[PDB]
A paper describes a structure:
The studied chitin utilization locus (ChiUL) is encoded by the soil saprophyte [name], which is a Bacteroidetes member exhibiting gliding motility. The ChiUL of [name] consists of eleven genes that encode four enzymes, a predicted inner membrane transporter, a predicted two-component sensor/regulator system (TCS), and two individual SusC/D-like pairs (CusC/D, chitin utilization system). The SusC/D-like pairs are believed to be specific for their cognate carbohydrate targets, and act in concert to bind ([name]) and transport (SusC) oligosaccharides across the outer membrane. The resulting ChiOs, and likely chitin crystals as well (analogous to the archetypal starch-binding [name] protein of B. thetaiotaomicron), are captured by the CusD proteins.
CusDI and CusDII exhibit comparatively low sequence identity (27%) and may thus have different carbohydrate affinity characteristics. Isothermal calorimetry (ITC) studies with the recombinantly produced proteins revealed that CusDI binds the full range of tested oligomers (chitobiose to chitohexaose) with similar affinities, and even GlcNAc, though with much lower affinity. In this assay, CusDI displayed some enhanced affinity for chitotriose. Despite considerable efforts, crystals with bound ChiO ligands were not obtained, likely due to crystal packing, which for both proteins affected the predicted ligand-binding site. The overall structures of CusDI and CusDII overlay with an RMSD of 2.2 Å for 363 Cα pairs and display the canonical [name] protein fold featuring four tetratricopeptide repeats that act as a structural scaffold. The most striking feature of the putative substrate-binding regions of both CusDI and CusDII is the presence of two Trp residues that would provide a flat platform for binding ChiOs as well as insoluble chitin, as has been observed in chitin-binding carbohydrate-binding modules (CBMs). CusDI features W280 and W65, whereas CusDII displays W330 and W74 that are located at non-equivalent positions but may nevertheless have similar roles. While both glycan-binding platforms overlay within the known glycan-binding site of SGBP-A, they are offset from each other, suggesting that ChiOs are bound differently by each protein. The area of CusDI surrounding W280 and W65 displays several residues that may provide hydrogen-bonding or electrostatic interactions with individual GlcNAc residues of chitin, while there are fewer such residues within the aromatic interface of CusDII. This may account for the difference in binding specificity and affinity between the two proteins.
Residue numbers in the entry:
A (entry chain B), B (entry chain A): 45 to 526
């Protein structure tokens, strides 16, 4: 009973479910926009903000503070109480820890990890390379422990505490952990392709393997909280469909558009997105473009869909790895999984179409925001296509399937450059962040500079360059995809 | 006859031998100082300059302009005249091309390579990753061609054109090419350890192997010019012994100090170095510190010593690669090779010393420039030391042996962080360049922004971040040494 209470704040703060204004700062005004998923019609701080590459420390500190207070602390506390005593809870805490904390390192680079809880005046940061090794080892520990208990036929003691689709089922938690390993493996393929291959193949070959059906998906099922985006969109009109989403989903005439977005008030019965990184004269100019749709009007918040497992395996197969299918088979299975998850028909026709491509983008009353399409690729698999075009197809479909979870899409975009996104028109970074490559990370936070200046200095050392949004984290090496 | 004339400008402009003021800008006021080899007593441009991390476009453009006009153009011209007709000359041009142009990409990152000589308005840059692949392939072509001729007993037709220690001997040119391959292979060990291993092992496996004795060293033997550093130092007093060299070489009581540097005029019979990245009141405050010594009072300019081949193999052995010998054997052999090269005795005692370490640095009349030692490692091999300490020993000895060739030392320092160097006290980069990590590259040059703006845009794209001195080139990944 003293252990079980630590899980709720972990579940409730991977994405901060309440209050909504905290989610808006934790993710809504960073990766949800940089990923190309969503855009704001509001000219916050005179239009000089995260969306125009002037990173705002007053906004971005919330990411660190809520994650450490609610995810990391409880991982630490649960481990202290359970490791070597109630190892099933320790194992489950490790899986949740990695789910929450990989997002943290993917945002900042170096982070506090091994030294968390230290009483030293300096709480040192680990390098991102070190954190990734630790996370893979933590998943090793968790998977071995739970698999042992499953093999023994041990009844779960986690159902009453679980807040996911899994209802305490250890096998489902292991399958999630395997899929999370596969995500982390693919993340590092440019910097450590040998480790990427090892960890990816381990994930797929583990007894219970990775996600195969939609019931395998990782989601938070809250008894009381709606996805915060519902309020930020429908109530506040502070976030809308993006121009990238309009270009790509209208181009493909994608039936998932109906659940992802609402038709526009300003343009009745039409799906209209807002361009990011623009000049904004008044909020009313874009607030009546398309809102975020029914997928966020729910107490269930998806954090990793089964579709992603297929697209990860498809990329692994493209790279020649032992993924259990061909790149084409896995690509097409991923698309079908997503169509099924969204409850829409026509997957077969969509999959076979080798004509439809991204559409031109028009901002009707502000043509300065217009663009020719940039993600110029069809859905249909072409065996004769280059590896880059094959990867572009896979990541495009992965990006569509993963909406509205902007953090993973931002990480995948940084790594692969896909899908192609419209560049910002206004860049107020003073040269620190490029228009072509956009935001590569967020700089170390105010609470840390205030209370842990010695730690921040270790973080800067392990970052290897200026502490701004243009400096690449360890896995985001300036290197080609193959 | 029409082909041979192209070689002289290549030989004479890897380091620009004349005029001396051009060498000062090409290398003397960048890597010769950033490497920790040398320091200026002169407060050029009010002390806001390359040495205080305000990169000066009017200085640094010389690197690109002289390299492309004299090395690259002649490689291109010779290839056009000789490829498929006189392949011995083509092969030799490729080796010289890689010797000159690897320095170029190591300085800027993306460079013009495959598209050189294009008539298009945009002459596109290649990525550094692409350039490295091409250089390895060029060395493959050169090595195969010359080895074929050697195997056939074909007499050299290059002696009258050669301006090195090799006197036209193809076998010595192949041995140099192998050693250059090994250098380039180790450079990329953090970004592409698989390719690093492949290319390093190829270098050693080739039938002539890498440099073994000092006569194998690559040097320019000028019939007319003295090393331009002799003038810059002795005549102009614009460059002096550095504080890092004083700390390290005095700490070890290294007998090579006597030929590397002259005793100070201000401090009779003492070796005194100047701190880099400082405030300078007047040139006279430091101009009478130690000058650069007898090693530059020569018409022979060393560009790759046999000692480096041993230290490359030593590091390869640390990594478990097929290098011939143990890390300890190769380390000690490299030190002996360097002592022999410089004509000094006492190698055995120096090699066995496990006490002497870097000395504290004092600027007698300006104590604000003082520092405790930072390269705190002894010479003696310790089998029980960590891989990092072993590497620190190897690179420290490599750094001493390679004086006064600052470019390779700067590249090795960027890759490994060794030897430890004194940080600058003044940093006028406006945040673009960190004090901790120093200059990682030079920004694209004025002549290119003026006459090839389309090409520069491709270079910036292939750089992956802001075009300034803090952005890391492809091989300079933020990753650990092992």
């Amino acid at each position: 009973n003293h252990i079980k209470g630590g899980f709720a704040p972990m579940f409730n703060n991977i994405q901060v479910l309440t209050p909504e204004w905290v989610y808006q700062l934790q993710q809504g005004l960073n990766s949800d926009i940089w990923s190309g998923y969503m855009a704001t019609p509001t000219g916050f701080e005179s239009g000089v903000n995260n969306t125009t590459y002037a990173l705002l420390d007053n906004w971005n500190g919330f990411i660190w503070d809520y994650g450490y207070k609610n995810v990391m602390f409880n991982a630490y506390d649960i481990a202290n109480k359970s490791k070597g005593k109630y190892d099933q809870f320790y194992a489950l805490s490790l899986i949740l820890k990695v789910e929450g904390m990989h997002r943290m390192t993917d945002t900042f680079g170096p982070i506090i990890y091994s030294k968390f809880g230290s009483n030293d005046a300096t709480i040192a940061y680990d390098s991102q390379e070190e954190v990734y090794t630790q996370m893979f080892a933590e998943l090793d520990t968790a998977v071995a422990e739970l698999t042992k208990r499953i093999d023994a036929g041990e009844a779960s003691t986690f159902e009453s505490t679980d807040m996911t689709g899994y209802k305490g089922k250890y096998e489902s938690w292991v399958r999630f952990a395997n899929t999370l390993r596969l995500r982390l493996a693919m993340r590092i393929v440019k910097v450590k392709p040998a480790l990427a291959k090892t960890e990816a193949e381990k994930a797929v070959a583990q007894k219970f393997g990775v996600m195969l059906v939609n019931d395998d998906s990782f989601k938070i099922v809250s008894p009381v909280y709606t996805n915060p985006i519902a309020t930020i969109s429908s109530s506040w009109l502070d976030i809308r469909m993006s121009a990238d989403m309009e270009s790509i989903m209208k181009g493909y005439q994608d039936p998932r558009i109906a659940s992802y977005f609402d038709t526009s008030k300003q343009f009745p019965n039409e799906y209209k997105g807002v361009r990011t990184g623009i000049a904004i004269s008044g909020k009313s100019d874009h607030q009546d473009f398309s809102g975020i749709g029914a997928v966020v009007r729910s107490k269930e918040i998806y954090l990793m869909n089964a579709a992603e497992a297929y697209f990860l395996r498809a990329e692994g197969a493209l790279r020649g790895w032992n993924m259990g299918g061909t790149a084409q088979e896995l690509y097409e299975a991923g698309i079908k999984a997503s169509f099924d998850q969204r409850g829409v028909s026509g997957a077969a026709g969509y999959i076979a179409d080798n004509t439809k491509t991204a559409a031109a983008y028009v901002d009707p009353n502000f043509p300065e925001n217009n663009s020719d399409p940039v993600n110029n690729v069809t859905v249909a698999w072409d065996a004769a296509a280059t590896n880059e075009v094959k990867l572009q197809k896979i990541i495009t479909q992965k990006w569509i399937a993963g909406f509205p979870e902007g953090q993973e899409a931002w990480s995948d975009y940084r790594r692969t450059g896909y899908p192609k996104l419209f560049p910002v028109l206004k860049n107020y970074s003073g040269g620190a962040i490029t228009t072509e490559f956009g935001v590569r990370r967020i700089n170390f936070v105010q609470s840390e500079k205030a209370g842990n200046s010695g730690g921040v200095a270790t973080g800067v050392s392990k970052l290897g360059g200026p502490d701004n949004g243009g400096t690449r984290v360890w896995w985001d090496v300036n290197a080609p995809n193959f």
